[PDB]
Design a binder for this molecule. Structure first.
Ligand SMILES: O=C[C@H](O)COP(=O)(O)O
Ligand SMILES: O=C[C@H](O)COP(=O)(O)O
Ligand SMILES: O=C[C@H](O)COP(=O)(O)O
Ligand SMILES: O=C[C@H](O)COP(=O)(O)O
Lengths: 474, 472, 474, 474
């Protein structure tokens, strides 16, 4: 019964109350995290504010040295961290060891990306002849206190993808780990503390969302909100932030537009590997298949073979399909499956449940009226939608409320490029599954998938402030 | 009795109701502008949404051609537009003609800068050996319908600085000209219509702010709100926009920090020219002087002479101090002046009201308890605040709720650079007054002066969406 | 008999000796240009060196104003300059006025692009913690005097492409027009002087190569040599320039790699349009077809139909095949054609020669021993080369000594991209012919095809010097 | 008595003959170096040509892993390499060890900088409406084989500054160590080979310039020459290169312009620290004090006491003034001192000579007639030159045939910026000594002082070719 604590002003501290964390696999007690109160969150913010000056008065290479030390420690304990993460959010054990390794690679790259940030030296001579002697030296300064709110699916990766870009840029970071996955956020904080990050530069906040979860967002000391989660909470954040800068990475129903000339075997393998990784619990996952009618049958057969080869089971057996995060999540996904079945959709895959453990349901004949065609299941369902033309596929893709990513499988790259130009998404992948990619590529969503563009350089550039210094050079 | 109309879907439209516009100089009826209803706003947004795809299907050079045409036409009617915008916001006629010519120059520069927006080609390898031979082609696409809300002080320049950067990027623009200054917004729309801009690409919205003011901000067709105005209204817009991208350019109490080793004559001339241009109704004006005690008396004397050389009167006489925009504005300035003089501030110039026409009040011995050290007047009042140290000056400057711009007057540029690093503003000017400047320069506020970075390149970038395309 | 004059120090200057220029189409006469002596070249160089300080002192928008005025005057006298151009180099009057118009467009774009050249404000904190208070403001200064040597092909376009990028960046320009199309260069100077560009900012130096050819290149006043022409002369310039910066745009042997999946009709049309534009006298024209065996016969038939549809005549009938520039050119192309004939290459189109007027020769079954497979003809002859594999095509394309551009005609863009990365050229066009393209695109050659990157942005950057100013900010 | 060998194709080689290398400190023999022949140089070039298309095919992060391994090994053996370097080139032991760790974190920065080189995605629609659908994907490809020639000055630092920016860019490198400092080049090769660098990727050439000196520069395998030496040999190289790209870092005569408002104590300290570091044997050292007559006497006294407190002796006692590299250098420097004192220059510090070890000479009343005012001594001689105005100082500064770096000591920064923009140098330091600076900063000479822009990013981009791939998106 481990009693994990909160990093606050460089000291590990606990709270009077604590939240118990149960495995989504078998409800094993993983430990407890403190249930902070509003005054505790307030004092963590005031520690951050006090640590900010000396942190941004450091040279970039020094902050990067701290970051590199953190990444080394994180890679050192990749199995300790990986096991706890694997039982905390019920993801495959190699998938959970893989997240820690990808995390360390991400913060190494962010440390090295954020010490190469170059300003501009602009002159007014090109705009007007009267300002020919004026020189603006434009650079970037930290926004201040960055508040990072991590999601459950990648509690170590999508938390470090906010902490490391903010830290190298000179900001202090306040981390809010998810409700499920908070022990992993505290373990990330342990790696940061072991590195030697100065007191107050990185603080953690754990608690009930009904007590401090709004209080930390509307706090006056917070200068930037970096949030990954679902679109409802993201829309609430966008209004609770006022006009303070935010980065929201919300839900996505990513389409796989498959056309007649698509190499269907590769398309099916990629579509299934994208759709069912972490049992569908990914924002950047293939969440619908929009296939043309002429190849829809063969694509459905290949998709069925791929989805039948998926091993459902328990995280430590390295199952492709592990239990979903909550019972409420399984109930919501089950409702989507029920609604599809009631409207005469062809479930060409066993449709059975075992509590949290759902089965990789591949549906066909999915129409506009089924909720599985629009709602993000965040679980193991994959709709197949048949369209008559490319225009119908593009209209179906752009009918979604989400614009995160999309895949276009073709053989004609000129055709794929103009479809990609037509798709109202942030990223289009040509003949590949949709993903966050190398975390040096831009990662952004549109209409409902969030605000701002991520990617390591884009995240460093987003939690900074432009400061122009203008003088005369005669 | 000119009945100005609204550009919607290329055609000119009027409404049943009408707002009447009176000069802040002598209250003459300048004309009337339509008071659109929420349904008419909706139709303007639908015209915009239908015009968007053919506008971004146009090549960049083809849209820049329209922008250059509009700038040439607008410079053609520099005197006609200038007189109307002079008597509409009580701006000096040589400054109102200058606003139009600088507007034309901004549209030219925006066209030619939005021609050259180049994307990236990232390679994946270098972050992972697995993602080697994945190529991301990163480019920018228009956000969609850009809603621009212009301020009264520059109805033509600060509406074009939202329209032209958005239009060149591929967006369609829905302009919301201010209440005082709506006629100049339609005079700017006249140029866009004359220069063959396609239907629905540029539309104008005029009406009472209690009928369509929130209806247009909250509309779902709006994809970007570009707003210039006051901090209360901007803070309201910030929440009303949701997670839609916004550009807010709110107020600012720009400080003029003067040190002991500083050319006081140059500093005084710059401080007064900045502070009292358009009689203080500028977001980027010197709105407070923070001088060190040793040079405070010499600077006060020099500042007083500079203020005394100011001409107060009528815009068409090219006065330095024309009347403020409204009576409520003058009452608010007069309240600040009263609060200051009822607290023993040394008024160094003759406090004198004549209706809207206020007088260039220069105050001294201003402390933190007077509400003129903190509140942005938007009128002809300059507080001198004396501090004992450079640290005291920086703390006083950073105590403001605004962070737009600031000036540091000294002779040690290394000292000025250090102070500029410490100042929580967007732009620091060393040994010059604050200004929006060369409009290619970044223009931004922090802390409460706004959200986002303006300046033409930054404006074009802000109203676009990154569109990555990854392949093998 | 029009006695054209050299623009020197704002004044029109003539010489004791004048070179006479005759029409390549009928040897008529067009006028004379001053054959300057070396002292005259010195006075032009000194005029430029004295004009340099006040031209640099100008604001960028003020320098751009002259450029825009020149562009307007050029677009005004489009038909006059065009007629003299089509007379000078036998180009085709609708393709000669097009050169004048594309030249004014280039000048406008160069002015507007040079307005926006922004510097860097680099900090040392990312590299070391001891330099964290040092700021480098890095901007670009003019090199000084730029010597632009134009070719006969495009004597106002490939001349403006050196003058305008140089002028907008603050340099003063020496223009050495081609010995043949010099009258067109003096017309360009007429336009620049009419715009009102200051005295000594743009001068022209005509003459005989044996007197002032190496003389102006070796002058110590010249700070940059921008030369486009033939590869041997380019090598001589590369030696003669010492360590002074140069930009050489030399010959090319651009290949059209045609694979089996290619759309052969599009390939044939693109290849013929690229290859026979201006009678093959372009460095960026297609100059050899490298085609796989399977589709080679169908491609050759399509290519033959395209070639035997080209108009051969005089420039004022707007012929696609107008006479080559001089008699030595026609003799060299005829020699290549003969060498191909004796080694049993299949002439797919008639082999005719009416003096300078050559007929377009499509040669099939061309092998590595015929010299038309390697040498740049600068004449209307295109060899088709058959290869058995994609690797054979890449080996044959990279066997050339030239590296300017190439086309890959394919249907698989992934394959086309792989081949493009394998081709040793500056630019690869996928399913299109080679061109200088939009002039904002980079234009460069590799191994034997030149030195430096052209394109308006790259040309502006090439003829400037980085000037870094480093100071403490704390 | 160690016999060092040449890294060729992953193997160590002696040739038949060996150049024996002696310590410039006394004469102590420290080893021999293979006197390679033209044939062996050819085999090394061919090994590099064969290793190229596997190093290119590697990922940027893998090539960077090799670079980081080399940097780690280099810091592991900093004292052994440093001691050998200090006796090899006669610099203080703490300064020879300090260019081994400065070299290692030059190598780290080079790798981290080279693995985020981004390309462009240019569209043609801004230039013309006919090319709106053309997209250029502009990326950078390795130049090929890089020839790096190091100077004796920094045989490790000024060698890695060419190797690492090359190797990270994907192109293989051949290193020619200086004749005096060959041991250090082979010691750096030892670290590169120990790191695991693939065979043929990093080779080393030693021998006699009369045998293999022009032979390697003129070799057709070489695609880029990166040379830092003296202006004569750089003039030869710029000619022998042809049109092959080169980077030349030649000599300098950096001036410290001191005006009347200047802080004279700071100027006096900075000037001596910059001028006499490594016995004045740096290209970027201060070699000229140009001071206004009002403050010239006070400056001269401060400078004299600054120079007098320097220590002259042995490198292992960490003398500030260690002996110059060879006897020819001491003869030339003594000739400069001679010419100065015959023409009635006022020696402010004693002039001495102990064969190779000279004493630092502060010369006042230096005029444009003494050779010490114009020639680069590469020895501990600093001439003070008095001028009557700032315009006279700028005229004297620009009178030099060198354009590398310059210092302006002022108190008015607007004045210092004015003068800096007037100065014909590559870098101007305001109120600080000239230096190569943080190596991320641009480093260049703009006169007969060099060709090309160095600095880690600038040298990475110099030894690459732009490759544009243009296709239609439509
Ligand atoms: O929330 C899930 C993320 O958006 C999915 O991206 P990732 O699995 O590549 O980190
Ligand atoms: O309303 C505020 C404007 O941004 C001020 O413009 P300006 O500083 O150029 O005079
Ligand atoms: O000399 C010939 C030029 O390089 C060919 O290019 P261009 O005809 O497209 O301008
Ligand atoms: O030019 C050479 C500089 O004097 C020293 O170079 P470095 O930065 O490698 O030590």
């Amino acid at each position: 019964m481990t009693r994990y604590q909160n990093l606050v002003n460089g000291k590990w501290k606990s709270s009077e109350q604590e939240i118990t964390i149960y495995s989504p696999i078998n409800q094993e007690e993983l430990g407890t995290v403190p249930a902070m109160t509003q005054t505790e969150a307030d004092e963590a913010m005031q520690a951050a504010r006090a640590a900010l000056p000396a942190w941004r008065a450091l040279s970039a290479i020094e902050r990067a040295a701290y970051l590199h030390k953190t990444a080394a420690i994180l890679e050192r304990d990749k199995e300790k961290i990986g096991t706890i993460l694997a039982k905390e959010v019920a993801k495959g054990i190699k998938a959970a060891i893989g997240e820690v390794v990808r995390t360390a690679d991400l913060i190494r790259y962010a440390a090295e990306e954020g010490l190469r940030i170059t300003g501009q030296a602009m002159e007014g001579g090109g705009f007007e002849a009267a300002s020919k002697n004026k020189l603006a030296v434009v650079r970037r300064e930290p926004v201040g206190i960055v508040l990072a709110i991590a999601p459950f699916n990648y509690p170590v990766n999508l938390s470090a993808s906010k902490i490391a870009p903010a830290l190298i840029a000179g900001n202090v970071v306040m981390l809010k780990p998810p409700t499920q996955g908070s022990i992993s956020g505290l373990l990330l904080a342990k790696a940061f503390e072991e590195a030697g990050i100065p007191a107050g530069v990185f603080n953690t906040i754990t608690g009930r969302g009904s007590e401090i979860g709004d209080y930390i967002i509307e706090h006056k000391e917070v200068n930037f909100i970096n949030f990954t989660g679902s679109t409802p909470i993201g829309e609430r954040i966008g209004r609770l932030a006022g006009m303070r800068p935010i980065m929201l990475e919300l839900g996505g129903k990513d389409a796989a537009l498959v056309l007649e000339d698509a190499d269907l075997e590769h398309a099916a393998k990629q579509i299934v590997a994208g759709a069912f990784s972490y049992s569908g619990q990914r924002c950047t996952a293939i969440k619908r298949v929009i296939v043309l009618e002429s190849v829809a049958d063969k694509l459905a057969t290949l998709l069925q073979e791929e989805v039948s080869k998926l091993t459902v089971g328990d995280p430590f057996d390295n199952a492709d399909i592990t239990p979903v995060i909550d019972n409420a999540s399984a109930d919501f996904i089950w409702g989507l499956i029920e609604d599809a079945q009631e409207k005469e959709a062809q479930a060409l895959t066993p449709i059975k449940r075992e509590g949290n453990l759902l089965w990789p349901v591949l549906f066909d004949q999915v129409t506009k009226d089924m909720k599985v065609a629009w709602e993000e299941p965040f679980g193991p369902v994959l709709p197949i939608i048949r369209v008559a033309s490319v225009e119908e596929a593009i209209a179906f893709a752009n009918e979604s409320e989400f614009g995160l990513q999309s895949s276009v499988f073709t053989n004609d790259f000129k055709k794929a490029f103009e479809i990609a130009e037509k798709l109202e998404v942030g990223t289009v992948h040509i003949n590949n599954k949709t993903q966050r990619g190398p975390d040096n590529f831009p990662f952004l969503g549109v209409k409902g998938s969030g605000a701002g563009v991520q990617g390591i350089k884009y995240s460093i550039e987003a939690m900074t402030n432009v400061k122009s210094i203008v003088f005369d050079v005669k």
